[PDB]
Amino acid sequence: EEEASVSVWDEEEDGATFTVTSRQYRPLDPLAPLPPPRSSRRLRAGTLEALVRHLLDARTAGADMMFTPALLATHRAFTSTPALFGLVADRLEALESYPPGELERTTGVAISVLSTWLASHPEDFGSEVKGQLDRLESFLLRTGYSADLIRNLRARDSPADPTDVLVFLADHLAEQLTLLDAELFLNLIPSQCLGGLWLCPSVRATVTQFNKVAGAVVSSVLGATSIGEGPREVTVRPLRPPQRARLLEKWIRVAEECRLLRNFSSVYAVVSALQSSPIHRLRAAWGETTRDSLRVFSSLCQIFSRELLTGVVPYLGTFLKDLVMLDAASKDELENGYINFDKRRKEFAILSELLRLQKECRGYDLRPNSDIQQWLQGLQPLTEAQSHRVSCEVEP
């Protein structure tokens, strides 16, 4: 595992730039002849056509292992699914005159790539790729070549009292918030998180629920129910500072139980709601909060979290921000018109983190509590304008 030499150089092809790396390691037996050097030839930038040539090259899987999954995961940021499918069908068609050995090899790579693509991202394929599908299966029958791949590609009543948070146990509430957060995080299409895209419903649905939880906290602490849409249309229940503190203490504990379940999405939803202007203002209510609940809350505030992500539900906003930073920092294309694939590798790196958090999220074993769920559904959260108004009314 101890290396002796590393050589790095760049090579140019038709419409692409590659980086070759050659690493010479010392043999395990120090007296043995030198082992063969370990190498990689990775595409750095190239035309959309050149990306597809590299995609369907049999050597790419061994010499550039990030390329295939990165391209398949990020392609919707710079091209489209029917466009990429079409260029794959293009490449295969321009290869029909080739000798049977080369034809069968590349067709095999194409079948392998399309199977991985379909397995990884089934939502990419629909009615829009109909012509490209016919383009593919006519090519296969024409060359006499995959059967399962074609088949698989063919197939594709009054508003709830917000203060009733007190009626349920805090660990149960956390478990129930996590159940909703987890299934949304599992249904998340990671590519929709990309700076170039974020038409992104799976991200929107995660953010909506995040906002509903944060809204529920603000609403219940203020003891208010949003009955209309305007800044003035609200109903408010009577709460003395000691009574309101019990609601603050309750949500603090719910946030704490979310943390123990590693649901950092709802931890942040609750903590940001409690740090929010219309809730921070409530100094009489906070003044009645027990010191133990305050120390827990401060500890929860200092988390916002990246180091703790090593069941689980992450706060998606941090990944959305990193992907916005990266999109702003890195160019889509180079001056020559080549797609800057380095950008896409850095994007995939973040996406693979999300993928590994998704498989860990599958580890949850939680049961739907019908009555907590019904309460959550009946919640009518206050708008930013309404909450500011009510807080000015309940604590002048």
Side-chain angles (χ1 to χ4, degrees), residues 225-231 234-294 296:
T225 305
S226 188
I227 56 155
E229 300 180 333
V234 281
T235 55
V236 184
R237 286 188 175 91
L239 292 168
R240 283 180 278 102
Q243 297 182 294
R244 198 181 311 278
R246 298 297 142 180
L247 287 152
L248 290 167
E249 287 157 13
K250 186 66 178 206
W251 283 112
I252 286 164
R253 176 62 63 80
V254 168
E256 178 68 358
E257 296 284 352
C258 286
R259 193 196 102 272
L260 293 159
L261 287 169
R262 295 189 63 185
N263 180 7
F264 299 99
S265 183
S266 274
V267 168
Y268 191 69
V270 176
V271 83
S272 66
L274 290 176
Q275 284 175 315
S276 194
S277 286
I279 305 305
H280 188 78
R281 270 199 81 260
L282 310 165
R283 283 293 131 206
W286 282 113
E288 294 298 324
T289 300
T290 62
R291 191 63 210 168
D292 203 295
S293 297
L294 291 170
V296 167

Side-chain angles (χ1 to χ4, degrees), residues 10 49 126 172 271 331:
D10 288 348
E49 288 76 14
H172 291 158
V271 83
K331 300 171 177 179

